[PDB]
Amino acid sequence: GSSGSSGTLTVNGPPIISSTQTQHALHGEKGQIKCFIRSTPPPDRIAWSWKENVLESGTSGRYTVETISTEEGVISTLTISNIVRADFQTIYNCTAWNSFGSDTEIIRLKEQGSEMSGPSSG
Q: Which ranges carry the Ig-like C2-type domain?
């Protein structure tokens, strides 16, 4: 056997998308959806598609995509100039790409009222 397997610590492979730090967006405010992409190395391309739309980068349809680079990996933040109820009804999904492979994470921006079990319609 080996007496003291001395070696460097590191990891590689496809882009791993843990989840998004979504929040309780308010009708009117910017619905930012920060994504925790623990990719290493980071992906070469990224696209934000929910239903039939696909925003790679820039600003369009009241959606502003912006990718970041963190020691851990990367973080794709998507801002929404004027978010609407529809936003919640629409499911978000980030699909990144890397020389290693690819991955996708589903995100559903819930509506204000997470820990509020108040009187609901029924």
A: 14-110
